[PDB]
Design a protein around this nucleic acid. Structure first.
Lengths: 105, 203, 217, 192, 56
RNA sequence: UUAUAUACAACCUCAACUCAUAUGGGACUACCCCCUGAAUUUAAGCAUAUUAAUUAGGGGAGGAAAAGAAACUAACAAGGAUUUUCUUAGUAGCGGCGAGCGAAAAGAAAACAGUUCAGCACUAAGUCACUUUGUCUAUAUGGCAAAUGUGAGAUGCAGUGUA
RNA sequence: GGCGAAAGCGAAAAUUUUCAAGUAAAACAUAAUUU
RNA sequence: AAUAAGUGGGAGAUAUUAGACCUCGGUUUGGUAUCGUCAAUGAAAUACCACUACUCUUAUUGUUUCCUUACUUACUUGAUU
């Protein structure tokens, strides 16, 4: 849920919680579309985000994730996943915490 | 491909070619009745463009409707009550003929669903369309799963419930602000949605 | 009833100007006479068809002009071989003749001094509207730079009250590669003097002094 | 009066040369199905172990299907096009001979829409455009393509220009011819 | 296919026959003053291809 | 093969069958769906307004129905499928500018899921369904081949490709 | 056959491939026949 | 020179001829020329050469609430087994 900046002069402040995700951002941020879809991104193929820093705004928010994303292996030879498999959630996280913060304004 | 040519020649109606190929075709098309099965769709390529293949068996049924207005059934000197409600001899129906011409298949034919439609021709005493029926339980059609969508139970008889080509378009459906009611579900299920008062648990 | 050396109906593109040099079927000089089939260009108003085009090649118009000079016409005019007179030929240009084999209206275009203007309709005026070679004030008449351009092919056309046109611009005896830059610049110098032009005429007409009129697009 | 894109049907090249046209087509049936089966089952047992790429020699025959053909016309690989004329509706075949003058390729029309589908093991076929340029049928190739030139392709520049068509017919024409036969029996004595 | 007869009836009209009303004969016909101006000049594209290729 | 003088083979429209083999009108209705559209009442009377795009309205569905992946917004430091609720708001306009009607993107909340058709070039019908005979079993209108037995299929089947 | 949004039609449904009952029958729609 | 459509270009064209050259006409040179650019002098400077177009004129494929007449296959109206 990445999206920022609500429309008119009522809001130059707030930022609605993320229904867009900008396909043309993604190739500039190391993805990898349908691999990210079964990760779970809400990848949606229809938003054409117009601003370079709004392009950048999710770019850091992308790289905010994808690192703490723990990479569970598929073939369990785990040669190419490739962040970690020793950070398995029983060892590392297993958190299942709700809130998913949107930077809190 | 020939089809992109033959659509490009289908449009150019008001010719001597198509009109005087309509002219032979039109009053060929009348000593036959209101219903008769055919093998082959007269337009093939606009029986194509419509979600259509030609396996066994996607039947085609000719149909005519009576090309007019609609007069309001009260006898001989018209309605009581109010002068908002007098005028008859010009009153006009709502559902277009291209969604009446699939009710007049779906009940005379007790066996089959309805898929799309396409016009052919028009002259003054009928407009007269085609119906691309679909069989429902030919034991081929269960294992043909690109057109599997229509033989769930909730899609049968899609002439009444208004989800053919024209019967979709008849009830005022799209988005946004040329359509803003109808939005509350169907059409005038708007005009039971918005008058629905919410006397709360805790006001 | 059209001719071969002068085409009328058939409209060529850009490569159809190469054979127009063949209009010199004579051996003597023929002055090309322009004309235009004009539409809604009425001459009795301020739309006066009177100006000068500047053809960058010299098609040698036979130019003789009496240079009326009062300390401003002939001071810098020794670079173009002026006659160097003191504006005294006006006293003999009308009411009498000069010499044998000569008329009293013997030019094509005339120049006047800036301080010698009120005489031009009075003593010479009634004897020149009978000729129609009347010099105007908008026909490149200042004689500060109008000396080197005098041998550099200056013309003056007066509009007729019968809707015709025949004035000398040049000849057709030379190469059509000269005429590739002659017509395509003179008619581009004709768009600026004519008015409200986007598409108001359908073709041009070009005619020599001894030939039939050719027509260009 | 049918408009003079018709009659592009059915002035159709008298059958003494047309039977020679089918004699090329006797070699160019697409595939017999057991011969199709015996070719592909040899892939299964022999060429699955043979590892050979040469001996297929995919034989050039005449292609079928309208949606095949109008690629093959436009990609300039086709040689001779045969389209039927007993046809429906026209729009699969109406514009198609008009392509051939603008695309330069010689074409022809045939009588009998079933005879193109008699040999190809379908039911009715309507579109057979030929690509084959082999030396075994190169001899009889040149003479029949010269015949369809003036009849179909060089005729194609003046076929729309001359057609009124649709004669009146026929008993009424007898009454039409009755008066002129009557008045010519009277015209023998007016000026006499 | 030939012509659709309003184009042909105006094909006579765009010869010399009063282009302005002929143009408004299309906007009366088709007709919206954005759509007609394309269908106006389409006729002249036929007419500018058949001024000297129209011989034989 | 048609002076309307015969066969055979297709085709094309097109029948008839105590053929084979199978699908459908009906019941209910609260909710839902496309339909047809009235009236007392209110204006202190009434005729356009209102009752109302409303009760019979009946033809259709289901555990969902319709909608739904924009020919939308908004005009901004942008947003972004459909549906219901809070608010937008009893405000904008429609109004015998009478009585009275009446929305809306935008703001926040649940849930979230995106994609096949048609049509260039996609480039050996490589397709699909019956049949019979067995494989394999199962209360299957069933899974594997085959005779390649039909027929459907080029008037186009399939794969890849889609606002 | 027809029309109606459907239910159904204050209806001499006389138009509706054969819309023939058929007839112990004959090739080669059994023969003139039955609205 | 009248009678220059008119009005302006023009300040001589054109034709002829032999000579020059070419296979040759012809162009050019000069002689001559009905007039004329010139003069004859006025309203247009008439030679030379015109775009335009009507008084209109011969002819062409004209849409025409065009009129009238036949045609028939669309369609309407019956008849018969």
């Amino acid at each position: 849920r990445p999206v920022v900046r609500c429309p008119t002069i009522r809001y130059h402040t707030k930022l609605r919680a993320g229904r867009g995700f900008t396909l043309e951002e993604l190739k500039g941020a190391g993805i990898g579309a349908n691999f990210a879809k079964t990760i779970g991104i809400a990848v949606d193929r229809r938003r054409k985000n117009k601003s370079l820093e709004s392009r950048q705004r999710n770019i850091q928010r992308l790289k905010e994730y994808r690192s703490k994303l723990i990479l569970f292996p598929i073939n369990e030879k785990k040669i190419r996943a490739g962040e970690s498999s020793l950070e398995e959630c029983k060892l590392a996280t297993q958190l299942k915490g709700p809130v998913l913060p949107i930077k809190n304004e | 491909g020939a089809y992109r040519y033959m659509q490009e020649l289908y449009r150019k109606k008001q010719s001597d070619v198509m009109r005087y190929l309509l002219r032979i075709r039109v009053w060929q098309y009348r000593q036959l009745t209101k219903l008769h099965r055919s093998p082959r769709p007269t337009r093939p390529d606009k029986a194509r463009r419509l979600g259509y293949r030609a396996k066994q068996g996607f039947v085609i049924y000719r149909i005519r409707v009576r090309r007019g207005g609609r007069k309001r059934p009260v006898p001989k000197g018209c309605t009581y009550g109010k002068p908002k409600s007098h005028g008859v001899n010009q009153l006009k129906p709502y559902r277009g003929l291209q969604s009446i011409a699939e009710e007049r298949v779906g009940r005379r034919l007790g066996g089959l669903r309805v898929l799309n439609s396409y016009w052919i021709a028009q002259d003054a005493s009928y407009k007269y369309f085609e119906v691309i029926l679909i069989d429902t339980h030919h034991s081929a059609i269960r294992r043909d799963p690109k057109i599997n969508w229509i033989c769930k139970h909730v899609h049968k008889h899609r002439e009444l419930r208004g989800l053919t080509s024209a019967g979709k378009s008849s009830r005022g459906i799209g988005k946004g602000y040329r359509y803003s009611q109808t939005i509350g579900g169907s059409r005038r299920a708007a005009w039971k949605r918005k008058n629905r008062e919410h006397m709360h648990r805790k006001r | 009833m059209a001719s071969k050396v002068s085409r009328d109906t058939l409209y060529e593109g850009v490569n159809g100007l190469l054979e127009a040099s063949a209009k010199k079927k004579r051996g003597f000089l023929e002055t090309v006479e322009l004309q235009i089939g004009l539409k809604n260009y009425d001459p009795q108003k301020d739309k006066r068809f009177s100006g000068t085009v500047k053809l960058k090649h010299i098609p040698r118009p036979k130019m003789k002009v009496c240079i009326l000079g009062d300390q401003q016409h002939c001071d810098e005019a020794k670079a173009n071989n002026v006659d160097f007179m003191d504006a005294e030929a006006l006293k003999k240009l009308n009411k009498n003749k000069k010499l044998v084999k000569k008329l009293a209206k013997s030019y094509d275009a005339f120049l006047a001094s800036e301080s010698l203007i009120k005489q031009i309709p009075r003593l010479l005026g009634p004897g020149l509207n009978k000729a129609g070679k009347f010099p105007a004030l908008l026909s490149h008449q200042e004689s500060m730079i109008g000396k080197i351009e005098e041998v550099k092919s200056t013309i003056k056309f007066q509009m007729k009250k019968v809707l015709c046109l025949s004035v000398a611009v040049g000849h057709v005896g030379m190469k059509s590669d000269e005429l590739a830059q002659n017509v395509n610049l003179s008619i581009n110098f004709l768009v600026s003097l004519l008015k409200k032009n986007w598409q108001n005429v359908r073709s041009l007409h070009v005619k020599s002094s001894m030939g039939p009129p050719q027509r260009l697009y | 009066k049918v408009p003079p894109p018709i009659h592009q049907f059915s002035q159709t090249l008298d059958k003494t040369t047309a039977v020679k046209l089918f004699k090329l087509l006797e070699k160019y049936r697409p595939e017999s199905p057991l011969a199709k089966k015996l070719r592909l089952k040899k892939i299964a047992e022999a060429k699955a172990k043979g590892k050979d790429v040469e001996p297929k020699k995919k034989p050039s025959y005449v292609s079928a299907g309208t949606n095949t053909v109008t690629k093959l016309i436009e990609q300039k690989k086709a040689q001779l096009v045969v389209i039927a004329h007993d046809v429906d509706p026209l729009e699969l075949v109406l514009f198609l001979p008009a392509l051939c003058r603008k695309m330069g390729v010689p074409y022809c029309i045939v009588k009998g829409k079933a005879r193109l589908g008699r040999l190809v093991r379908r039911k009715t076929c309507t579109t057979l455009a030929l690509t084959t340029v082999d030396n075994n049928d190169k001899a009889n190739f040149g003479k029949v393509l010269e015949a369809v030139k003036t009849n179909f392709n060089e005729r194609h520049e003046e076929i729309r220009r001359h057609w009124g068509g649709g004669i009146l017919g026929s008993k009424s024409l007898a009454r039409i011819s009755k008066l002129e036969r009557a008045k010519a029996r009277e015209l023998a004595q007016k000026q006499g | 296919v030939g012509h659709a007869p309003y184009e042909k009836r105006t094909m006579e009209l765009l010869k010399v026959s009063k282009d302005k009303r002929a143009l408004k004969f299309l906007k009366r016909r088709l007709g919206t003053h954005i759509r007609a101006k394309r269908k106006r000049e389409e006729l002249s594209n036929i007419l500018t291809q058949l001024r000297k290729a129209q011989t034989h």
